[PDB]
Amino acid sequence: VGLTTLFWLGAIGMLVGTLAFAWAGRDAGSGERRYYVTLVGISGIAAVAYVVMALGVGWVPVAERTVFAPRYIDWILTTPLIVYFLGLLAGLDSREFGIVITLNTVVMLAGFAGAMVPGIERYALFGMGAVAFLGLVYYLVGPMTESASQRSSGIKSLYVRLRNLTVILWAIYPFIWLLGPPGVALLTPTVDVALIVYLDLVTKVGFGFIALDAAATL
Numbered sequence: 001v002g003l004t005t006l007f008w009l010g011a012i013g014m015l016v017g018t019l020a021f022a023w024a025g026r027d028a029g030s031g032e033r034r035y036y037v038t039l040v041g042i043s044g045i046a047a048v049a050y051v052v053m054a055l056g057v058g059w060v061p062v063a064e065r066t067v068f069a070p071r072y073i074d075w076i077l078t079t080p081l082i083v084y085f086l087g088l089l090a091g092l093d094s095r096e097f098g099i100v101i102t103l104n105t106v107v108m109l110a111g112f113a114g115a116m117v118p119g120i121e122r123y124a125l126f127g128m129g130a131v132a133f134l135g136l137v138y139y140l141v142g143p144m145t146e147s148a149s150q151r152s153s154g155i156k157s158l159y160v161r162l163r164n165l166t167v168i169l170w171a172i173y174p175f176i177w178l179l180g181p182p183g184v185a186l187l188t189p190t191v192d193v194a195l196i197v198y199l200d201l202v203t204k205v206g207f208g209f210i211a212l213d214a215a216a217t218l
């Protein structure tokens with residue numbers, strides 16, 4: 001199994017999620033539609049990014065490594081949508097959304113920038129992202145959880161389930177980044193991509209399926 005193959009697998013998984021979310025939201029009352037649309041965009045954008053990488057585009061040479069630019073474009077656009085989904089579920093107002101969305105953006109921008117910087121100073125960008133990430137986790141586990149507590153028992157339960165999925169799985173990315181080509185380059189590009197393809201699929205499609213389950217049960 002090579003990079004190309006791993007990218008195709010990611011494209012296929014994202015496509016399956018995209019189609020399922022689009023279908024399940026066919027009707028969608030008039031206030032629940034928002035959730036389905038966000039899911040379609042999250043997995044849809046990732047699907048495109050993976051096909052692009054699978055076709056060999058965006059493989060940017062940096063120092064003695066390769067940076068998959070599409071992955072980062074994908075993250076920068078999709079992770080804020082995931083955060084939006086959680087904030088909607090938690091019942092946040094504009095100001096609340098604004099804070100978590102910017103922290104999220106700082107994480108992804110710093111990571112992309114760090115990956116694109118050849119020198120050892122790139123770790124300074126990585127650190128910036130790590131710090132903003134802790135801020136994001138704080139909001140997810142604190143204020144946003146407090147806000148969610150004002151919703152029905154089911155919604156609060158779905159929020160908690162997805163919050164846990166997000167906090168735990170997202171916290172893993174920085175380590176894979178630090179151990180792979182972007183950092184120490186211990187893990188080969190293939191192993192790093194394999195691990196990240198799984199993580200992307202679960203944080204997006206796994207995330208979506210869990211939500212659909214809750215919606216159905218509700």
Ligand SMILES: *C/C=C(C)/C=C/C=C(C)/C=C/C1=C(C)CCCC1(C)C
Pocket residue numbers: 046075078079082107108110111112125126127129130133170171173174177200203204
């Ligand atoms: C669908 C894609 C997802 C859910 C991607 C998530 C990515 C992260 C949580 C990345 C985090 C990073 C840090 C916390 C430190 C700086 C470097 C990053 C970008 C790998």
Ligand SMILES: [Cl-]
Pocket residue numbers: 066067068069071115182
């Ligand atoms: Cl990369």
